Structure formats: structure tokens, C-alpha cells
Design a protein around this ligand. Structure first.
Ligand SMILES: NC(=O)C1=CN([C@@H]2O[C@H](COP(=O)(O)OP(=O)(O)OC[C@H]3O[C@@H](n4cnc5c(N)ncnc54)[C@H](OP(=O)(O)O)[C@@H]3O)[C@@H](O)[C@H]2O)C=CC1
Ligand SMILES: NC(=O)C1=CN([C@@H]2O[C@H](COP(=O)(O)OP(=O)(O)OC[C@H]3O[C@@H](n4cnc5c(N)ncnc54)[C@H](OP(=O)(O)O)[C@@H]3O)[C@@H](O)[C@H]2O)C=CC1
Ligand SMILES: CN(Cc1cnc2nc(N)nc(N)c2n1)c1ccc(C(=O)N[C@@H](CCC(=O)O)C(=O)O)cc1
Ligand SMILES: CN(Cc1cnc2nc(N)nc(N)c2n1)c1ccc(C(=O)N[C@@H](CCC(=O)O)C(=O)O)cc1
Ligand SMILES: Nc1nc2[nH]cc(Cc3ccc(C(=O)Nc4ccccc4CC(=O)O)cc3)c2c(=O)[nH]1
Ligand SMILES: Nc1nc2[nH]cc(Cc3ccc(C(=O)Nc4ccccc4CC(=O)O)cc3)c2c(=O)[nH]1
Ligand SMILES: O=c1[nH]c(=O)n([C@H]2C[C@H](O)[C@@H](COP(=O)(O)O)O2)cc1F
Ligand SMILES: O=c1[nH]c(=O)n([C@H]2C[C@H](O)[C@@H](COP(=O)(O)O)O2)cc1F
Lengths: 506, 506
């Protein structure tokens, strides 16, 4: 009685694994994973057995794999005894004689085809599943991986990797069937109520924890957002704010995101990527005219730029969509005397974005690559004070550009998915203009909250197991950061769950 | 064969437990901990046995404890059979007959005196130790807790609690004697080198991990700093900077600190608390004269305020210790045209600190309580750009004041211990002026680094097991935040390790 594991690489949605007798992709790192996961043994005097169908045996050229014994399932192949590294059995059941005897076999792996996968789960022989989800779907398949039965639960999900612009994950599904420290902490939690800081930061309950079975393997960095969503539902204090819609708020959180091998665009909800870019390039160009976004069918700044909202906050004399000095006016013309959105401010103010780019490539190891937007002198003229307040940038020793963002207030339903993608794109743009590669993205949050009208929606989003991040590449290299266009951005491998509607609190 | 645990409350340094037949302190929460830790049982049809000496039996008034069987060790007391909850044995060895028979006893606890504690460890009967370290030392003891033998290792250290201005911890010492997820992550770490983000954030090795035996119980919030020290020693990239002393730097870190029941002043190194305050009140008053700190014997701003350093950065015309517009000039006179340190700036600039206090008590649930110091227009006039750049404050539903601080650059040897205490004191001052209690302190760090001349010192600091945080209380309630004086601050229960000398990089 030893371990039997399935190793497979299937597509993310349709679970396709083959086409015309070969794989529908060429991922080098995946083959290395298969080689290391099937050679992983504890006894040096034992070998691992790899069960596979005949057509798969034809796919690998009918040649043995080093340090392993290939078990071919076929009714026609002659049970040859010449090659000691290849053995043939007539049916799958007989091949599981590796259990009963043959103590020289330590582990068993089932890396066959649809025919072998299907009647290996149906016959209930599989203990573990090593799944390699690949983000390719608009191609043709003819051989699929069967649906994972409900007896299996995911226990690990790696970060999203990239090979030839193809995103892929690594998951582990397992078949389901000290206390002295935990008890002492519980007893101290009963004595001190909210005096013990642990009780102010309780672990989320299972009913609000996305994919609860993955306990120790929450490596995928979308969990940095889905678990922040859970921490708010658990510890969020019911509070009122400037709007009529109350929130559940906690203070002091952070999220990390990789940008080297993936793009932190959430997959549990279809995020409008075009509107994010059109807002970011709107900041970079220095524009404050709210109509230029409406002319491009971007209505995210319409609520805070209406005639009734401006008169309500004391800016009735201001024009319709004149948001005033905001993001992109403190970036390009800091401390500049703002008049209207039609005047020409070329030359006035401190150009932080220009000095940022000039410093990033003339002094990379400088510790002052900071782009701020909090101007106390201009706060009263703003239609809305800056939420993503201050950002710092960092050049690593391997010529990568990381980014840290502090956010005073975070709408986890609407603003947060945008802010993650927006500052990811901005870091990539700065990397190309300065000649670096994208690094990491860390977002530090002050007032992390959830609007009470988003409770039914965000609980729906938490019920969706995350999919691998897509890839974002630029089609051309620009000479100045202002020259970026929407046609220059190519989003590769984005297969999200259906979009979720959530109303903005004005 | 069941479990035998020691329960004891000893002083932090000398390990005193008694005086004149009674305890040297009155901590209510500690007695509740003893009651719950000795009643913790799994079988409802069994009771726990509490072994204690005769003099301890006199201390509790010779009356039984509910739901427990007290075992008194005494050579003179008559072995009475009347009370079934009290039994007397002639020696400690005979009393450990609870093991051999009497299956109605589930657990055994040794909460005796020095006489019972000493020959319970010497006879090697103890499996676990529940230690309650109390921060009282300048009093008189006559009964001590014996030194913990090397066979025990700490596995848990709770946060610092407060009762009647007395700080105390809870530790657990234990006697020393799935893999499928860990292996898959290791295999992916071999395939992808630094492409897997986990390899850029490696767990610190044991030789640089403070108190490595405490794996799952790093509750004490001094570990938020000692483990950041370890993460830098593990992943820190060797980089040069504006000074001649290179650093080991990582990007994007955070630390949490409780301020309700303790004061985050590091105990692994004696921190000059007076110099921290004199710098903070120097900021609050709006002063930029570097000599006023030297007149108060505070020389932390002498390196960056010398005649040779000012001429080196292009400010030769500036006076000797005229640091220019820095912290405390952007706080009180933001965007104010700076001349010299002798002029009168009363009225010019935006007073953030005043508007911060006015907003904290007139609109607590506001999400804009932000105090910034990054002014791009005044950066060129500064002797040193702001390190603690921007801070945000938050009022909880139970009238507590939390604080978030973003720090672009962090000298983990010198600036970090100061910044932790400085913004802790500032939050407490704002709480008293606004009528709140201290809450939490979260510090978000950009360039967290360690200067290479601090390597021998910081490794020494990592070899010291942390002690409970002290308490900081104000002697009087001030009417304005500027009225605070050093005589008004009382530091209670600070018993740190000896101070460590580290040179500042100018
Ligand atoms: N992405 C991935 O991880 C993997 C993908 N693949 C791909 O899948 C494709 C091949 O898989 P597939 O087409 O399903 O063929 P299979 O690999 O599953 O093998 C099929 C053969 O196995 C034998 N067989 C199957 N069931 C039985 C049975 N109940 N009793 C006796 N013999 C049986 C038959 O051999 P016979 O007719 O001779 O008796 C049959 O022709 C290829 O494109 C391959 O590249 C393969 C492995 C892994
Ligand atoms: N901080 C804490 O957690 C605790 C503190 N304390 C404090 O400690 C003080 C008391 O402890 P302490 O003074 O050490 O006295 P003890 O509680 O250790 O008990 C002493 C008595 O135990 C008996 N005894 C001890 N050793 C032996 C032996 N080898 N054989 C037979 N009998 C033995 C003797 O009784 P006899 O002479 O009658 O034979 C002796 O007088 C008190 O102040 C108490 O409050 C007590 C418990 C816990
Ligand atoms: C056609 N086929 C089946 C195949 C392909 N990809 C997979 N990918 C995954 N994740 N899981 C599988 N079971 C799997 N199976 C193949 C193809 C090549 C090799 C192979 O050459 N393996 C070498 C590895 C070669 C290398 O290191 O790049 C080995 O050492 O096992 C194995 C199976
Ligand atoms: C003198 N003495 C010994 C004593 C005192 N403090 C300690 N504190 C600690 N952490 N550990 C000990 N072993 C300990 N022992 C005492 C004093 C009072 C009670 C006592 O009354 N215990 C009640 C608790 C009373 C309450 O809940 O406040 C119980 O239910 O056990 C026990 C032992
Ligand atoms: N309270 C408050 N005020 C704000 N002022 C400005 C903002 C930024 C902001 C960011 C995002 C959206 C938004 O509608 N997103 C969204 C989400 C899911 C599906 C479709 C869309 C719309 C689309 O297809 O673009 C709106 C506003 C903002 C905020 O998020 N909250
Ligand atoms: N590179 C660089 N530039 C700086 N400019 C300004 C600072 C702030 C700062 C903070 C602390 C100290 C300092 O000497 N601490 C210390 C530590 C241990 C023992 C004794 C003392 C001195 C004492 O008793 O006060 C000096 C400077 C600072 C910095 O920390 N690093
Ligand atoms: O980029 C943004 N990100 C964001 O999260 N918000 C949300 C956060 C909050 O719900 C509201 C502003 O909070 P407040 O108006 O109280 O400062 O806008 C707005 C943005 F523009
Ligand atoms: O409050 C402070 N905290 C701090 O950590 N430093 C250190 C960090 C770094 O070692 C140096 C400034 O880094 P740089 O001069 O490169 O901006 O001062 C200075 C302060 F004033």
C-alpha cells in the first residue's frame, strides 16, 4: 500500500490535454516539473512507476524515461521482457499489482490519457492530483482531462508563471477521508476581550474564506486580495462616512503582487481593463478634464464630476466635469495655481513624473523615487482628495522596477481591483521608458472597507476559485511615456469569471 | 503516563515569585490564567491535580480550589481523609503516584514554591512550563523560581499585557526530545530561480532567527522588528548609496505594534527614550533650529547639520545647524517660503497638525486624517529629505486612535527603533488632546536596509530573547499638544538588555 498520484497538464476552462496525438502547447518548465515530480523518491534503491496509455507511449517516441519504470496499458502491444524499464499490462486493474508485491517500487504515477485518467478516477485508485492549469482555450482539442470528482479537494495553488506569453499554474488536489499553544492563546483570548490584539485581528471563518481547503498553499497572489476581502468581513466595524452607504472598515493592511511572470488582474471578476488604462494615461498626460474620459466611454469619474455633486461640496462655480487639481496635476504641475481645466499649465509647477523618470535611469539605487499626490494647499479645490496618495519606486540589482503604494481609503469592491491593475501598468510603463523589467507591486492600505450594498456581490466573488493571472505586453517601445495608446496594450490569457455589477457610492 | 506542567509567575530578571508568605504583586488577569490553565481538561469525568508545598497551601488560606484536587507536600500535616479535594503526601516522589494509578486524574500541575519547583526539575518530572514574566524588579523578594534547565525550549511568547501599570507576558517552555506541499514548492523553486517570487522572499535561516524554537507562537510584537531584521539578513541585496557605507536592502515591508496594553519600545537594546521625545516635541513645536537639540544634549541631528555636510550638498551659505524646512516645518507651515531658522513663521503655511487635531475630534470617522511631509517644492532646501514621509490616523468605534506610517528609507540599526517609539508617543499625545485611547501602530517601509558596519551589532541584538514591553503614561493632561515636557513622561517597567553602539552614516 503506497501512494498513487495523477500528473496532468490541462487547459484552464475546458481541461484539454492533447490534440492530434501531441500536446497543444510547448512549455519547457512544465516538462521539468513532470520530470522532478515523478523522480521524487525517498529510497535510492527503488524506482517510481509511470502508468500511461499506449497512445501516450507513442507520443514520447516509445523510449524509456531515465530512472523510472514506464508501465504501458495496451491490449495489443507484446508483453516484451527485453527492456527492463518498460512493462506492458492488458488492463489498468492488473497494472496496480505494483501495490501487492514488487517492493522495489516506491510511488506510482498515472500520467496517461483520457482513457487512462477516466477509469483511474472511476476505479478510485488515485490519492493525489498534480494539475498544471494552462491558459489556452481558443484552440482545438480532441482529448480532455475528466472532471475532478467531489472526493478531491485542492490543497495548494502556486503563483502564475509565464512561458512564451502563456500563463500557467500548479495545483495539488488531495483525496480527503501543537494543541498546547492553541489552547493557551484561546484562554488568553477569553480573559482579555479586545485587549488582546489577536482578537482585533481574528482569522476569517470558513464561510467567508475563498477556497477554504487550501490552507498552507495560498501561493497565488490573487489570495492577497481575496483574503483581505475575508479579513474585512470578519473584523470590519460598521461605520458611517460622507456618503449615505455605510461601510465595514478595518485599518492597516497590505497586499503583494508579482509582475515578473504575470499581471495582477483579478480573475474572480471580469475587470474593465480598458477603462483602467484610459484613466492612467489621463493622469500621465496631466489632464484634469473629466469630459475627455466620457468622450472615450469611461464613466468612472462621472459621479464625482456631476453638477449636483460639485455644488454639494461647495464648488458650484466650477464647470460641469472640471474635477480640478487631482491626480495628474500634482504629478505634472505640483503646487501650481489651478484656474480651470481649459488653461495651459505647461511650465508651471514641479514635474514629479519627469524628475521621477530622470532619476530612475540616472540614479537607480537612489532611495527617493517618490511620486506624491497629497497637496494640503490644493485639497480644498479638489472634487475628491487623493486615495492612492503616495508611491515609491525601487530598482533591484537585476534591473527590475518594484513599486510601493500607500492608499488612505480603499473601496474593496470597485477601487481596489482598479488600483491593483492601474499601478501595475504604471510600473510597467516606467520600466520600459527607463529600460527595466517589471518587478513587484506592494500596496499598503489605510482604511480598507466594504460598502454594505456590495455584500451580496463580494460574497459571490469569494465563491469562485481563482484562475491564473493573464499576461500584459506592450506592442511597441515608446520614446516618451505620454505616447502610450490603448492599441499598444495586448492582454494575453485572460479567462475570468463573469463580471459583477456594483454601484458606486458618490 | 500523563502530562505534568509547571505553572508559575516570576519576575522578568531575578525570577522572584514571593515575599513574606505572599505574592509581590496583585494581577487579577494572572490569577484567571492560572484558574483556566489548571481547569483545562478533556474528560468531564476527570479532575486535574495541583501539587503545591505547605507554605503555598497556607498562602491560599488552606481552602480547596473548585473542580480540582490539591496535592499538598508536607512532612507535618496530617494525612486527612475528611476533605476529598485535598490530599497530603510526605514527599514529592510519592505524590507522583497519580501516574501509576488513579485514572480519574487527567493532568498534573506543579504550582508550588521554590522548594517544590527546584526538586521537580531536578527529579526530571516536568514536561511543560507556563511562565508569567512580571516586570517588577526594584522590590524585595525572598523566594525565587529556579533557573530553567537547558532541556527546555520556549515555544510561545504572548503579547505584553498591562494591569495597574504593570507589564507581563505569558510564555510556554517545552521539554524537547503535509510534506507533499513542501516538496512541490521546493521543486518549483529549483525550476524557476528568482522567477518564483517565493525565492525573492526566503524564510530566514535558523542562525539569524531570534529565538528559533518559538515557531508558531511569535505573538510578542517585538518580533515584528526582530524578524524584519532577519528577513533583511537573508534576502538583502548588497547595494551602495549616497554614503560610503553600503547596505543590505529589501523593498516593501511592514510592522504592527500594540499600544493599548504596552509601549513598543525595544527591549533587546536600551533605546535612548529621552532623545526620541526631545526630537518629537521639536517637530511638534515647528522648530527647525538644530542647535536647540544640541542645547538639550541631543546629538542625533549633528551629523546632517555640520558645516562640512551642508557645503557638500550645496548649502554652504546656510548657517551651522540650520537644517532648513524639514519635519515640523511641513507639519506646521506647509508650502511656506523658508528663509532662515531665526525668522518668525507664525501664520504662514498650512498648519496640518492643527487641522489634524481639529478633524480628529470634530469628525472622527473621517478617512482623511493625514499628516504629510513630502513637499517636492522644498526638497532642494532640506538638509535631508523626509524619511517618515506620510502618516494617516484612524479613530475606531471604541474611541481608540490608530496610526499608519509610510517610511521611504529605514535604517534598521538606528532610525527604526527611534521611529517606532517616536510615532507611538505622537499617537498617544494626539489621543490625549483629542480625548481618545492609544490604539495600534502600523509602519509600512519602502527601502528597509542594514548598514554593513552594523552587522556585528545587530547579530548580537538577535541573540537576546525579548522581554515584555514597558508602559508609558503621561503625568498631566495638557491643554495644547505643544505643552508636553520631558518631566510629564513616566516610563514604567523598562528592563532592557545593555545598549549597543552603532555609528551613523552621514
Ligand atoms: N497534457 C498531459 O498531461 C498529457 C497529454 N497527453 C496527450 O493525450 C493524447 C493521448 O491520450 P489518448 O488519446 O487518450 O490515449 P491514451 O494515452 O489514453 O492511451 C490509449 C490506449 O490505451 C489503451 N487502453 C485504454 N483503455 C484501455 C482498457 N480499458 N483496456 C486495455 N487497454 C486500454 C489502448 O491501447 P490499445 O488500443 O493498444 O489496446 C488505447 O488505445 C496525446 O495527445 C498525448 O500527447 C498524454 C499524456 C499526458
Ligand atoms: N508566583 C507564583 O507563581 C507562586 C508563588 N508562591 C509564593 O511562594 C511562597 C511560598 O513558597 P515557599 O516559601 O518556597 O514554600 P513552599 O510552597 O515551596 O512549600 C514549603 C513546604 O513544603 C514542604 N516541603 C518542601 N520540600 C519538601 C521535601 N523535600 N519533603 C517533604 N516536604 C517538603 C515543607 O513542608 P513542611 O515543613 O510542613 O514539611 C515545606 O515547608 C509564598 O510567598 C507564595 O505566595 C507560591 C506558589 C506560586
Ligand atoms: C507527451 N508526454 C506526456 C505529458 C506531457 N506533459 C505533461 N505535463 C504535465 N504537467 N503532466 C503530465 N502527466 C504530462 N504528460 C511527455 C512528453 C515528454 C516527457 C519527457 O520528456 N520527460 C522528461 C523531461 C524532459 C526535460 O527535463 O525537459 C523526463 O525526464 O521525464 C514526458 C511525457
Ligand atoms: C498564592 N497562590 C499561588 C499562585 C499565585 N499566582 C500564580 N500565578 C501564576 N501565573 N502561576 C501560579 N502557579 C501562581 N500561583 C494562589 C493564589 C490564588 C489562587 C486562586 O484563587 N485561584 C482561583 C482563581 C481566582 C480567580 O479567578 O480570580 C482558581 O480558580 O484557581 C491560586 C493560587
Ligand atoms: N466611492 C468611490 N468614489 C470613487 N471616485 C472615483 C473612483 C474610482 C472608480 C473605480 C471603479 C469604478 C467602477 O464603476 N468600476 C467597475 C467595477 C466592476 C464593473 C464595472 C465597473 C465600471 C467599468 O466598466 O469601468 C468607479 C470609480 C471611486 C470609487 O471606486 N469609489
Ligand atoms: N543615515 C542616517 N541619517 C540620519 N539622520 C537622522 C537620523 C535619525 C537618527 C536616529 C538615531 C540616531 C542614533 O545615534 N541613535 C542611537 C542608537 C543607539 C544608541 C544611542 C543612539 C544615540 C542616542 O543616545 O540618542 C541617530 C540619528 C538618521 C539615521 O538614523 N540614519
Ligand atoms: O482610486 C480610488 N480608489 C478608491 O478606493 N476610491 C474610493 C475609496 C472610498 O470608497 C472613496 C473615497 O473615500 P473618501 O471620499 O471618504 O476619502 O473612493 C476612490 C478612488 F479614486
Ligand atoms: O527618521 C529617520 N529614519 C531613518 O531611518 N533614517 C535613515 C534611513 C537612511 O539610512 C537615511 C536616509 O536615507 P537616504 O539619505 O538615502 O534618503 O536616514 C533617517 C531618519 F531621519
Amino acid at each position: 500500500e503506497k501512494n498513487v498520484s495523477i500528473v496532468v497538464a490541462a487547459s484552464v476552462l475546458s481541461s484539454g490535454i492533447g490534440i492530434n496525438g501531441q500536446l497543444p502547447w510547448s512549455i519547457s518548465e512544465d516538462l521539468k516539473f513532470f520530470s522532478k515530480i515523478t523522480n521524487n523518491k525517498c529510497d535510492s534503491n527503488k524506482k517510481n512507476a509511470l502508468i500511461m496509455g499506449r497512445k501516450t507511449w507513442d507520443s514520447i517516441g516509445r523510449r524509456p524515461l531515465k530512472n523510472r519504470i514506464i508501465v504501458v496499458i495496451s491490449s495489443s502491444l507484446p508483453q516484451d521482457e527485453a527492456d527492463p524499464n518498460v512493462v506492458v499490462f492488458r488492463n489498468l486493474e492488473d497494472s496496480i499489482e505494483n501495490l501487492m508485491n514488487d517492493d522495489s517500487i516506491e510511488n506510482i504515477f498515472v500520467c496517461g490519457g483520457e482513457s487512462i485518467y477516466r477509469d483511474a478516477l472511476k476505479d478510485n485508485f488515485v490519492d493525489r492530483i498534480y494539475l498544471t492549469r494552462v491558459a489556452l482555450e481558443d484552440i482545438e482539442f480532441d482529448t480532455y482531462f475528466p472532471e475532478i470528482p467531489e472526493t478531491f479537494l485542492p490543497v495548494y495553488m502556486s503563483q502564475t508563471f509565464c512561458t512564451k506569453n502563456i500563463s500557467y499554474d500548479f495545483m495539488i488536489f488531495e483525496k480527503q477521508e501543537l494543541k498546547s499553544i492553541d489552547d493557551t492563546v484561546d484562554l488568553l483570548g477569553e480573559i482579555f476581550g479586545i485587549r488582546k490584539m489577536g482578537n482585533r485581528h481574528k482569522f476569517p471563518k470558513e464561510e467567508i474564506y475563498n477556497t477554504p481547503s487550501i490552507r498552507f498553499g495560498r501561493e497565488h497572489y490573487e489570495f492577497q486580495y481575496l483574503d483581505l476581502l475575508s479579513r474585512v468581513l470578519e473584523n470590519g466595524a460598521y461605520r458611517e462616512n460622507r456618503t449615505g452607504i455605510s461601510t465595514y472598515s478595518i485599518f492597516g493592511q497590505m497586499m503583494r503582487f508579482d509582475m515578473r511572470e504575470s499581471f495582477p488582474l483579478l480573475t474572480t471578476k471580469k475587470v474593465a481593463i480598458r477603462s483602467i488604462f484610459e484613466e492612467l494615461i489621463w493622469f500621465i498626460k496631466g489632464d484634469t478634464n473629466g469630459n475627455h474620459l466620457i468622450e472615450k466611454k469611461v464613466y468612472i469619474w462621472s459621479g464625482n464630476g456631476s453638477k449636483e455633486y460639485l455644488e454639494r461640496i461647495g464648488l458650484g462655480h466650477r464647470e460641469e466635469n472640471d474635477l480640478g487639481p487631482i491626480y495628474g496635476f500634482q504629478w505634472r504641475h505640483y503646487n501650481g495655481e489651478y484656474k480651470t481645466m481649459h488653461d495651459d499649465y505647461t511650465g508651471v509647477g514641479v514635474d514629479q513624473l519627469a524628475k521621477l523618470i530622470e532619476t530612475l535611469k540616472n540614479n537607480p539605487k537612489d532611495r527617493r523615487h517618490i511620486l506624491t499626490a497629497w497637496n494640503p494647499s490644493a485639497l480644498s479645490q479638489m472634487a475628491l482628495p487623493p486615495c492612492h496618495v503616495l508611491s515609491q519606486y525601487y530598482v533591484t540589482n537585476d534591473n527590475c522596477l518594484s513599486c510601493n503604494l500607500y492608499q488612505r481609503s480603499c473601496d474593496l469592491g470597485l477601487g481596489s481591483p482598479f488600483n491593483i491593475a492601474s499601478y501595475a501598468i504604471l510600473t510597467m510603463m516606467l520600466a520600459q521608458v527607463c529600460g527595466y523589467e517589471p518587478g513587484e507591486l506592494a500596496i499598503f492600505i489605510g482604511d480598507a472597507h466594504i460598502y454594505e450594498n456590495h455584500l451580496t456581490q463580494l460574497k459571490e466573488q469569494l465563491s469562485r476559485t481563482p484562475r491564473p493571472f493573464p499576461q500584459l505586453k506592450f506592442k511597441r517601445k515608446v520614446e516618451n511615456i505620454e505616447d502610450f495608446k490603448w492599441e499598444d496594450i495586448e492582454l494575453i490569457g485572460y479567462y475570468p469569471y463573469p463580471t459583477i455589477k456594483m454601484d458606486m457610492a458618490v
